[PDB]
Structures are given as structure tokens and as C-alpha cells.
């Protein structure tokens, strides 16, 4: 249960690409960009849409649905770039696909960083 | 010799196009133009946020696709195709698109053209998917193919003037045949080629004149034949022998395959120790498959390549690791490395030859 | 289970914040300001600034001001030069103020984008390429005055002892002082006597600025001063930064924003390197020298860590230095500075760092 | 030799050498526009022991070339000697001011 809350973890753990919930992240971790795992950096806007990953939590042995909502409308954060691809699939499975910009439907589609939001059990 | 107004110094037949996403500063993407024979930088075309690029079939123009906003990070959005002179590397014409052109990594299939060169065919996502048709001559967006919802990417048919296919979520292919005006005249859907859940394919085709081959996450090969009126599908056959399987060799990359049409050799980026999540790993090796005999005829070091492209007439393969471009002679089954162009890009997953 | 939210403010208090202006010269159309916490090196946020942005913080600490250039299609189309006002805590865009299409495009010297001491006017350098100073009225949100009197001059040095006065350095080796009226137009002006020989002892434009005087260092290691305690600026110099041992190794200043003044102590900080000769005026610092500007003597010297630009916080007795990519934080409460930490990878190509005002 | 920052004519270049960008020492790459104005350098020619005026006209209206970046400062002076100064964009007056690369044109002695 403690491993389900990134805010209680060591910052060096959550800012790493191998942190369990970052398993299908292609972009910059918002937690390194002035935000947190679940909050956009100041002045960047959440995407209403996202791709979704299924990630294993090795701390509790369960598998979880993770929504990779972007933060948008600022230029590239440039920090903590990750490119993990667990259970990622091509564009013919569009909401499992991370080689597209999930800021695409925002008022400003410039990609700033990516968050890893816990939806629930897979 | 005047100060400005110059054309590219090397002949068209020497030119290649490295699409640099510049992902760290994605609003300043650009196309770098190189001479593959000596590695000389010849010029560039700016492409704003996440540009895509192709060269017109006739070799006379460069087409780009991009997104602008009035104040970049705020203000009104303009999605466009731009037409540039291939020799002068100068802007000519903007063509307005609806504000849903695909923003994504530079797979060849997101931005293509018909065999006859008369239409640009591009992928949209709003995030609902459709395929857009642009009439080059008229400089107009003319048709939104919403029939392609649930599908992804454009595979032109080199045996027809204005037909293409797309890969759909049912594991099949949708063919679209355009009329003279660019509106959809007819369409057809194949039977299931591959299992989406059990053996997903990479989208990149190894494309012949009337057939296309595709490789899968687990090292299988599927084909689509479009010599007939309707597409016929088959597969799988495996890229892997027993030794390969025991070492868990699988494909990995982006534009990860190619076909040398005269010989039927297919080129594929491969890596060992494949498991869930390794489908975009750089190449440990390039494998060369005879698609008729279904046997591997060569394996060579991959130089960490992610994308490739083939030139038929000069028997050439280019590979690209994100920043460096490798040039191979593929006239014989075993490729020979001719040279490496270091620092051709900061973050490129696509290279293309000028058509000859 | 969770939902992503925006609308958030900068996590660390204003007193912790510094602003690293990253030109991103290799991709200069995507310059930006990086906001850092100097106490721990944490990245707090950023403000995009398009082509060759410049930045400052409002004197009251509430707003960030940027200056930049847009075009309708970036590399073609109509040009728009602007000042933007952003909220300091939310790092959100609030307003754009239009400028004539001649704002200076250049490296981020402090003196290209400043404000009057009362914070009521933004004062910026224009180049068309004929030079003038532009005045932006903050209350009105409008450009209100082109100071064409400053033709042949360069950079803006605000006078901290007057509400709406500033100086500029002219091609005659003197200073032009401009006193604005409450409407932001020129109320009066005056020109000093020659301070330095332009040909023989050119000064760096960066001031070591006190309440009522400014010091400048020269390409050859001399110091000049402009006293604006009164209505007419009185100029003096040179005195040399160098003692006899220093001359042997040809020590000279080098950098961009290369000097600073700790006003309470009168200590001036200067980036220096040995083996000075023609063409070395932008070389990285081999050392930082600390000069008592009253006694006209060096009181300390420390390794420079290849720094090019600096800034000083008076209240907390701090100096930041910057080598293009990394920011060093020094305690300057005593004559010999003490290195506290280095923030690595703060920028790709920055020649300017500034504190949030406290 | 001409692609090196130490080439004698490049003595006050702060930018990318156009000769590495698809142009030459004296010509703009395709699709970039020469600046009508420039800063000028005074550079020593080691072959005849003479000093020459070099004009650094930029090529403009394309984004940064990124190749052969040089930062040489021989006889360069601050903005109060404006046409000797290289910390400003000499594309500043062009129809499009985006900086692409710099040329090094021999004017005379
Ligand atoms: N999911 C990362 C990403 C951002 C932007 C673009 Cl264009 C493509 C992929
Ligand atoms: N002379 C190079 C240069 C270009 C642009 C800017 Cl903004 C500054 C310097």
C-alpha cells in the first residue's frame, strides 16, 4: 500500500525511469520538471486523454492500470527522459501506443512532460 | 558566384533526408540534407513542431507536414503541409489541414503520397483516427477518410496510381482507392492477417511492387498481396531457427525493415534476450532474409540502428541510430558497410533517399 | 483512483528562487527561463521565451517579465516583438505588450532589459541597427517612448537612488543620463565628461552597481567609476586591478556579466584569467578576484570554475556564478567567498542568472 | 582549413560557419538569405603578414545550422562600438531574423 503513493517515496526513486509505475513512459517525468507524479508543473495543462499502461508493482505483487496523461502548453522540460515500453503497442491499438503526442487534443499541443496516474487494478 | 539564391551543390542522386525531431527542443525540428557518397551536409529545411517530411515522387519538391501556433505555446493552431523546392530548399506553398494531423514519431507511414504523385496521404488523430487526402495540384485538403477509424498508417500500392492500405485493429488491412478528385471511390477490407493480442506486427512494411511483408513482436512474418482486386493475407512464418529461438532473438526498432525488390531480400533489425517491452531496442544485428526461401542469408552487426531505408537502383541500405547514418552496399546477400555519417541529427528516427 | 491536476504554484518560497536564462543557442527559437531553488538545486519550473528571450523579475517580486520575437511562421511571416508579463508563482502568461520590431537580439547581458528603480517602467535596448532605448509603461501595458537621444550608445544602467533615471554607455567614452517624467517620456538628460578611452582602454558594459555610483572594468584590467550622487555624473579612473606580481602573468578580466558589487562592504567581484591578450575578453574565469573599491586593493582570490557570468544578492550575502551550464552558489559574507554547492545542468547555453528579489 | 575556427579569416566569428552548412565561406546555404548589414573584424593574414577587414554577413531565415560553432573575439568590442560587436544577431534587420550561419568575406586591407 505504501508503494501505491509516490508522494511518500524517496524523490530519487520516483524520478527514476525504473520506478514501477513508469513502465510505458515515453517522455520527461513531470516529477523532475517542477511537478509531481500526479500534478503538472506550474503553467502546464493536463491532457484529458492519454495512453494507458499495465505495470507490475513488485512491492505488492499486483498489476495496475496506469494512465500516462501529459502536461502540455510549455516547451520540452528536457529532464528525466524515459523510453520504457512494457505492454506498449502500435497505433492500431491507439490508446496503448506511446509514439504519439498525448497533448494532441489540448488547447496548446506543445509537449512539456508526462505523469503516471494510478487508475486501479488491472 | 552570387551570395544567395544557390541550389544544392550535389546532384539529386546523391541526396538523403534525415528528419531530425530534435525531441529535446521539439519546436525546432528540421530536415537535414546530406550527400551519402561523402557525408557532406548540403542544407536543411525547418519544420517547426514535430515535422514530417517526404520527397515528391518526381524528385522536384520536398513536402513537409507540421504544426504552428500564433505564439508557439499559445494562440491559434495551424496544421499545414508545405511544398518546398527540392533544389533551392525554399518555401513555395502552404496547404491548410484540419487541426488533427498526427503528432508523433516519424514512421514512414504517417506521411506518404500516391504512386501517381497526385495526392498526399497523411494520418490524422483527434484522437479518433482518419486519413487525410491532399490534392497537390489544387493545394487543397479534399477528403477525410473516416472509414479508416480504428486503423493506423498509410501503405501506398506501387502497382496502382491512387490506392493505399492501412492496418486496422481487427488484424486486417483496409484498402482505399481514390477517384480522380481524391474522394474515396471504393474500398475493401481483407481477412485477418495477424492476431492483434497474440502476435502484433510492427507497422513498417517491407514493400514490394504488389506485395508487402510485416514482422511481428515475436519474430514472425506476415504478408499482404495486392496484385488482385482484393488483398490476400498470410503468415506467420518465423524469422528464427532453433538456436535463434533459444537466445530469444526478436525484432526491434522503428522503421525497422526493408526490401530489396530485385532479390527478394528482407532486412530486419534484431536483438537477443527479447521479452515484453524490448520492441524498440536498438539493433544488435541486421538480419537479411530471403523471403522466397524463408531462410536467413546473412547477419551483421547492427551498430545500434533503429531505422533504415533502401534504394533499389543503387542497391543501398541506410541505417540510423538516432544521430549517425550508416551506408551499406546490399548488392550481395551479405551487406558491406561503406561509411558512417557522424552527427547527422540529434534525434532522428527516419532517413530517406531522394528518388531517382 | 488518482486524477492529474494543474493550476499549481511554484513549490518553493520566492526567497529560494533563481532564474537561469537558457538561450539554447543551438536551437535559439526555443530559448527559455529555468527556475531553480538555489538552496538545494531543485528544478521548479520554466517559462518559454521563443527566439532569443530575455528575462527579468518585477522589482516587487510578483511578476516575471520576458522579451522575445515571434513570427507568424517562425522562419517567415510577420514579426512581433513583445514584452510578456507572467505570474511569478503560477508561471502563467498574463499579458503581451507590443514593441516596435527592433528589440535587441543578442546575448543576455543584464543591461539590455531592465527597469527603473521604482518598477514603473521597463527599459530595453533597441537596434534597427541604429540604437535607441525603448520605454514600456508597466501600469498602462504600453510602449510609450523611444529614446533616440541614446543613438550611438549601448545598454541600460538604472540609478538605484532615483525612481526613473538610468544611464547608458556611449561611443564617445562617456555616459548619457536619462531622467524620465511620470509619463515615461524624457524629462531631462545630461552627458558626462569622457570616462574611458574607447580605443585605448575599452570597458566591459557590465556595471558593478552601488546605490549612487557604478564601477566598470576594462579589457586591460583597469577600473573606472561613474558617481551619480548628484544630477551630473562625475567620472573617474583608471585604477588598476593588478599589483606587480599580477602583471607578470598578464592577468585581465574576462566574461559576460562578469562583475558584481556587494554594496554593504564595497567589495567588487570580477572574473579574471591569466595570459591576457587581444581576443581573450570573453574567456572563462581562472579566478574570481574580490576588490575593496575604497582601498583600491584586492582582498581575496579564489578559483573561478570556468565561470562567465555572475549575480549578487545583497540581503543574503550571496554570489551565483555560471559557466554556461552549471550554477555555483557562494557565501560572500566574508572577504573570501565560500562555495556552498553547484547545480549541474541548469542550462544548455546560459550567460545570465538572477535572484528573485526579497 | 576553412571549416576550422582557427582559419585566419574567422577571427571575429560568433556563430556557425556557413561552409559547414551547405554554403561556402562567401555564400549562403540554399534557402538562407544574406544580411545587408554586419559586424566587421580585423584579422591577421599569416601568409603575407598583413591585416584585413573581414565582413561577417550572416545568412538568415532558417533555424540554427548547428555545425562548426566558433566564438573568436580578435579585436571585437562591445555594443558602444556597434559594428565591431559580435554578441548581437546581425540578421536583426532581415525580413526574417532567425540566425542560420555566418560568412567571412574579405573586404580589403
Ligand atoms: N509520448 C511522447 C511524444 C511526444 C511528442 C511526439 Cl510528437 C511524439 C511522442
Ligand atoms: N552573432 C551570433 C548571434 C546570433 C544571434 C544572437 Cl541573439 C546572438 C549572437
Coordinates of N, CA and C and ligand atoms in Angstrom, one line a residue, chain A residues 24-28 51 70 97-103 109 111 114, chain B residues 23 26 49-50 52 101-105, ligand 1:
Chain A
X24 N 5.5 2.4 -19.2 CA 5.3 2.7 -20.6 C 5.4 4.2 -20.8
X25 N 6.3 4.9 -20.2 CA 6.6 6.3 -20.3 C 7.5 6.5 -21.5
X26 N 7.1 7.4 -22.4 CA 8.0 7.9 -23.5 C 7.9 9.4 -23.4
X27 N 8.8 10.0 -22.5 CA 8.9 11.5 -22.4 C 9.6 11.8 -21.1
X28 N 9.4 13.1 -20.7 CA 10.1 13.6 -19.5 C 9.2 13.4 -18.3
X51 N -2.5 7.6 -23.3 CA -2.3 6.2 -23.5 C -2.3 5.6 -22.1
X70 N -0.2 13.6 -20.2 CA 0.8 14.6 -20.3 C 0.4 15.9 -19.7
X97 N -0.6 3.1 -27.2 CA 0.5 3.5 -28.0 C 1.2 4.8 -27.5
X98 N 2.5 4.8 -27.3 CA 3.2 6.0 -26.8 C 4.1 6.7 -27.8
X99 N 4.1 6.4 -29.1 CA 4.9 7.2 -30.0 C 4.1 8.4 -30.7
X100 N 3.0 8.7 -30.0 CA 2.2 9.8 -30.4 C 2.2 10.8 -29.2
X101 N 1.9 12.1 -29.5 CA 1.8 13.1 -28.5 C 0.4 13.1 -27.9
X102 N 0.3 12.7 -26.6 CA -1.0 12.7 -25.9 C -1.5 14.1 -25.5
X103 N -0.7 15.1 -25.8 CA -1.2 16.5 -25.8 C -1.9 16.9 -27.1
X109 N -0.9 22.1 -28.0 CA -0.4 20.7 -28.0 C 1.1 20.6 -27.8
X111 N 4.3 19.6 -26.1 CA 4.6 18.6 -25.1 C 5.6 19.1 -24.1
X114 N 5.4 14.2 -18.9 CA 4.5 13.1 -18.7 C 4.3 12.7 -17.3
Chain B
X23 N 14.0 16.2 -30.4 CA 12.9 15.9 -29.4 C 13.2 16.8 -28.1
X26 N 11.6 20.2 -29.4 CA 10.7 19.7 -30.5 C 10.1 20.7 -31.3
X49 N 7.2 22.4 -35.1 CA 6.9 21.4 -34.1 C 6.7 20.0 -34.7
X50 N 7.6 19.1 -34.4 CA 7.4 17.7 -34.9 C 7.1 17.6 -36.3
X52 N 7.2 16.3 -40.2 CA 7.3 15.1 -41.0 C 7.7 15.6 -42.4
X101 N -3.7 16.7 -37.6 CA -2.6 15.9 -38.2 C -1.9 15.2 -37.1
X102 N -1.4 14.0 -37.4 CA -0.7 13.2 -36.3 C 0.5 13.9 -35.8
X103 N 0.6 14.0 -34.5 CA 1.8 14.4 -33.9 C 2.4 13.2 -33.3
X104 N 3.5 12.8 -33.8 CA 4.2 11.6 -33.4 C 5.5 11.3 -34.1
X105 N 6.2 10.3 -33.6 CA 7.5 9.9 -34.2 C 7.4 9.6 -35.7
Ligands
LIG1 N1 4.8 10.4 -25.9 C1 5.9 11.2 -26.3 C2 5.8 12.0 -27.6 C3 5.7 13.4 -27.6 C4 5.6 14.1 -28.8 C5 5.6 13.5 -30.1 CL1 5.4 14.4 -31.5 C6 5.7 12.1 -30.1 C7 5.8 11.3 -28.8

